[PDB]
Amino acid sequence: DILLTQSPAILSVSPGERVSFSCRASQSIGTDIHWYQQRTNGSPRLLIKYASESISGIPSRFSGSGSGTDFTLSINSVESEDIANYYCQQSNRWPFTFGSGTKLEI
Amino acid sequence: DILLTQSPAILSVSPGERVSFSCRASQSIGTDIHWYQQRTNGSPRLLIKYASESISGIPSRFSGSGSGTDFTLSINSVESEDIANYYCQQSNRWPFTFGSGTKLEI
Amino acid sequence: SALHWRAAGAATVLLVIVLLAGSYLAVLAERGAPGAQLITYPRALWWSVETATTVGYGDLYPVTLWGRCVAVVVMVAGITSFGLVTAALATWFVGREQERRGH
Amino acid sequence: SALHWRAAGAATVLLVIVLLAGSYLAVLAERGAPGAQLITYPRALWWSVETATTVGYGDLYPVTLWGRCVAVVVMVAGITSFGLVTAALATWFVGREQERRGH
Amino acid sequence: SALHWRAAGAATVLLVIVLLAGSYLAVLAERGAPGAQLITYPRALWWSVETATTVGYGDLYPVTLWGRCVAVVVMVAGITSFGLVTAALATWFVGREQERRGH
Amino acid sequence: SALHWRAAGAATVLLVIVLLAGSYLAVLAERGAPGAQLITYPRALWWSVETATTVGYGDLYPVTLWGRCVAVVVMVAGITSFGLVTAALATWFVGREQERRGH
Numbered sequence A, B: 001d002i003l004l005t006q007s008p009a010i011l012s013v014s015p016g017e018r019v020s021f022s023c024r025a026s027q028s029i030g031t032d033i034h035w036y037q038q039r040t041n042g043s044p045r046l047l048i049k050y051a052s053e054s055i056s057g058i059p060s061r062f063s064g065s066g067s068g069t070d071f072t073l074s075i076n077s078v079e080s081e082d083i084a085n086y087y088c089q090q091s092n093r094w095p096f097t098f099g100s101g102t103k104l105e106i
Numbered sequence C, D, E, F: 001s002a003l004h005w006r007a008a009g010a011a012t013v014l015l016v017i018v019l020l021a022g023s024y025l026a027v028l029a030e031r032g033a034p035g036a037q038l039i040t041y042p043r044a045l046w047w048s049v050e051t052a053t054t055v056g057y058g059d060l061y062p063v064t065l066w067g068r069c070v071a072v073v074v075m076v077a078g079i080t081s082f083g084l085v086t087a088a089l090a091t092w093f094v095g096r097e098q099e100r101r102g103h
């Protein structure tokens, strides 16, 4: 069972700054990494798939990068609406798994 | 993204002695390792390619060795003109990457 | 029309069918198996082609009894097809030669 | 009946036999060799098919002189069979063509 | 001259062409894909030969949709060529035999 | 005697020769290359057979320009041989059929 680690668990940033969340897999997963956003009392929302691919409807300030075991989800110009929990999930090997999650904080 | 680490960041040696710079990759890259020299206010200059292969025009005192994750760039008889920053770069996997660089000092 | 040309092409529709069904059955059989990698259709399709052509790069392969059973069928379809064309190109070169000589 | 059809099928019983004996001899030769992975029958059977079809995924392979000797036989049986069928499908397409033309 | 000998050789110029274009298209499609290894021409050429001959050692393989599309073409060219020669050597052995007997 | 049977066997002596020379040239070309594994004769011989049969398990493969040049020759010899036998078994099945019918 792949283990995705998201540290730090909490992230503090100033309005407008560039922020980055880390996800690291216990083994090489290529690019099979996907990000989700979850605000207070909401359901998860796909933000990035296959480490860097964009989704229709997601603000152009969201990007992703990485391969193997190190992945990064970035946000250029952190706003209000970004306050939320971020999770990463892999599809490389069965069963799919989820990161511990990271809370954004302005 | 392969991570090439060049430690130490600075190197002190006496005129004429043999010196060696280390570069280590976060994963096995075979011999796809290349060295560059950069003096004060100059542009990079290819010194060694594919870990050990020589370039036309580079002083015979420059050599290279290594494989997988451990590479070494050596200089027999360190002179004046060697004072400069040394970098390593890999071509094994996309995207190409660069080492943090090492400064030679006599 | 010419038999050898019927089966050759026919084996090409069949192969494609086995190639697609292969991808589907592969995922279905491999999911549920810890550590399995043949778990999404897209790559599972690339795995099929790989198999059918016996190129086997080793970047993806089945680990369950059924995935493997599925693999044996894809391999055999690939091999039988690629060999039914060769046997066809032979019946063709033999026919043309047989006329450039007298018969 | 038709020779080419006798050997083709005959090579199919033979291949299966070599495939089963292969699995057995493989384990027997590999056990005792530190680090060897071809050590249980089930997967050793999957290894045989893999070999016979030259798909070689690289998930399993012999490391001892005898395992390899065993592998060379499975490979050759696989290759000789898969080629004795092709040569059969050729004698078949050649026969049918030869009648759809005059002879 | 003999048809079967025309296509055989012709498939040999074609294969070489596909082998070179393959190397070029491979790099072009794989660069830009994190973790891709088929990114320089020299080895990309060695990858082509590997593929065309279905030897697939697994030391290099495509990871992008286009690299793979490129791989399927190289594989097929390799397989079609190597099979168009066999079908040629058959039309040749059949011709010689047919004369060492009477026809 | 029968041409197709001459070349088939002849290609079998040749293949064996290329298989042995291959092992020797392989080591010679790979030694000196950091990280190379095709560096002792015994396994280098197992590598040859692997290559010639296009089974390619991926446990051993060349990394130098010459080792690879050597590999291309072994592969091609393997493929040309295994295909010159098939073309032989075809000229044989065609001959027998041609008599079990009238000619």
Ligand code: NI
Pocket: C103, D103, E103, F103
């Ligand atoms: Ni006749």
